[PDB]
From a paper:
To answer this question, we reacted TssM193–490 with ubiquitin–PA and solved the crystal structure of the covalent complex to a resolution of 1.62 Å. The asymmetric unit contained two monomeric copies of TssM ∼ Ub-PA complexes, which could be superimposed with an RMSD of 0.488 Å (2,026 atoms). TssM193–490 was fully resolved, with the exception of a short linker region near the N-terminus (Pro-202 to Leu-207), which was not resolved in chain A. The comparison of the apo and the ubiquitin-bound form revealed no major conformational changes upon ubiquitin binding; the DUB domains of the apo- and Ub-bound structures align with an RMSD of 0.35 Å (1,115 atoms). The contact surface, has a size of 977 Å2, whereas USP7 and USP12 use ubiquitin recognition surfaces that are almost double in size (1,729 and 1,816 Å2 respectively). Most prominently, the linker region between α-7 and β-6 (residues 473–486) is in an optimal position to coordinate the S1-ubiquitin. The Littlefinger residues Gly-480, Val-482, and Phe-475, together with Tyr418 (Thumb subdomain) form extensive hydrophobic interactions with the Ile-44 patch, but not Ile-44 itself. In addition to recognizing the Ile44-Patch, the Littlefinger loop stabilizes the ubiquitin C-terminus via hydrogen bonding to the main chain of Leu71 and Leu73. TssM further stabilizes the ubiquitin C-terminus through a hydrophobic interaction between Tyr-443 and the penultimate residue Gly-75. Arg-72 is also stabilized by TssM but uses a non-conventional contact with Glu-485 in the Littlefinger region, supported by Gln-375.
The betaproteobacteria Burkholderia pseudomallei and Burkholderia mallei, causative agents of melioidosis and glanders, respectively, encode the TssM effector, the only known bacterial DUB belonging to the USP class. Instead, the TssM family has evolved the functionally analog “Littlefinger” loop, which is located towards the end of the USP domain and recognizes different ubiquitin interfaces than those used by USPs.
Numbering used by the authors:
A (entry chain A): 191 to 201, 207 to 490
B (entry chain B): 1 to 75
Write the structure that this text describes.
């Protein structure tokens, strides 16, 4: 048979990637492996280390985007030593997102759950690196988002207080008191696809399903409101907000596990718990889910 | 003319309006009756969010039409 990939290991923004093939490869026959982003953009790789006659390790020449999927693409024409050539590319996929659990963001000022929840969604989004380089977003917010995983407890809490103050000083976010997750997304300049503005749908779910390819963040402003079971494309969903009308929590996914984050409290949750979430609170009429983040 | 605004608490609000009423005007009438600030209201007709500077006429809302009200309470 022609060569095949039988294992992929990513053991960051410049990861080392290992590919293992089923049989020894003619080394001259793999000169331009690339990683491709979801829009087709190619990133070249550096030299190939031959860990064996059938296992290679390499790294992209340039830093990859945070929270992003990349296809490892081995062009057609790779050849085994036994002479068989592939007629199609060999591909594998990975994501640059971290796999460690996410972190709590305490409700320092007592009315910040809408800010904390929006920051959790932003730090899980494919838009993160765009936020980090956006000079219209307050520097303190960018600082917090950039070292969310690595910051010490004390540093995280200091950075969070600075970020909240900077957000509250923007026009979009209330200067004190409770708010809405959309306000914070507007301050972060995160592009959102409003489902109501869809030219090819009259409800939330269909607007998401028939949006332009590679739309990654949605604002659910059509009708009826969606439950978790109703969100399309669960395989690519990575975060959403959840309001009871009076309080917000974030749901975020890392390494195939969903977490519920209520301010400082992080819990790992089951698919069953997500499936039980209502689309709105029937007691006060307030919508549950307004922001959905896809990888 | 009379329109009906249905909520997710299962209430129907009956409003007396005119085709030339702005959406902001309709939210003000809801605020008067129900004590909900306009910035915590979303109004919907035929799946579309109604925008604050448009009129009922802009959306072809006619006598006896039914709108949905979705609340967006602060947290
Ligand atoms: Na403000």
């Amino acid at each position: 048979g022609p060569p095949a990939v039988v294992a992929t290991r990513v053991p960051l923004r410049r990861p080392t990637i290992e590919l293992e093939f089923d049989r020894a490869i003619e080394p001259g026959s793999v000169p331009h492996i690339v990683l491709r982003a979801d829009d087709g953009t190619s990133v070249a790789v550096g030299p190939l280390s031959w860990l064996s006659d059938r296992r290679i390790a390499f790294a992209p020449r340039k830093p990859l985007k945070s929270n992003s999927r990349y296809e490892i693409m081995v062009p057609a024409g790779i050849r085994s030593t036994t002479g068989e050539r592939s007629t199609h590319p060999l591909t594998s996929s990975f994501d640059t997102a971290p796999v460690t659990p996410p972190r709590g963001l305490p409700n320092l000022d007592g009315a910040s759950c809408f800010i904390n929840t929006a920051l959790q969604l932003a730090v899980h989004s494919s838009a993160l690196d765009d936020i980090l380089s956006n000079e219209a977003v307050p520097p303190a917010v960018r600082t917090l988002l950039e070292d969310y995983d690595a910051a010490s407890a004390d540093a995280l809490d200091a950075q969070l207080a600075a970020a909240v103050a900077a957000l509250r000083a923007t026009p979009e976010v209330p200067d004190s008191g409770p708010g809405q997750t959309l306000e914070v997304m507007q301050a972060l300049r995160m592009p959102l696809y409003d489902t109501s503005s869809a030219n090819n749908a009259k409800n939330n779910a269909d607007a998401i399903r028939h949006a332009p390819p590679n739309t990654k963040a949605f604002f659910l402003n059509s009708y009826p409101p969606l439950s978790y079971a109703d969100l399309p494309n669960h395989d690519r969903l990575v975060a959403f907000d959840y309001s009871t009308g009076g309080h917000y929590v974030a749901y975020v996914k890392r390494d195939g596990i969903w977490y519920r984050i209520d301010d400082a409290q992080v819990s790992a949750v089951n698919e069953q718990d997500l499936l039980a979430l209502p689309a709105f609170n029937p007691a006060n009429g307030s919508v549950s889910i307004e922001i959905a983040i896809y990888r | 003319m009379q329109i009906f605004v249905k909520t997710l608490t299962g209430k129907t609000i009956t409003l007396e309006v005119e085709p030339s009423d702005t959406i902001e005007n309709v939210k003000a009438k809801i605020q008067d009756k129900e004590g909900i600030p306009p910035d915590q209201q979303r109004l919907i007709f035929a799946g579309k969010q109604l925008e604050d500077g448009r009129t009922l006429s802009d959306y072809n809302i006619q006598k006896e039409s039914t709108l949905h009200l979705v609340l967006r309470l602060r947290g």
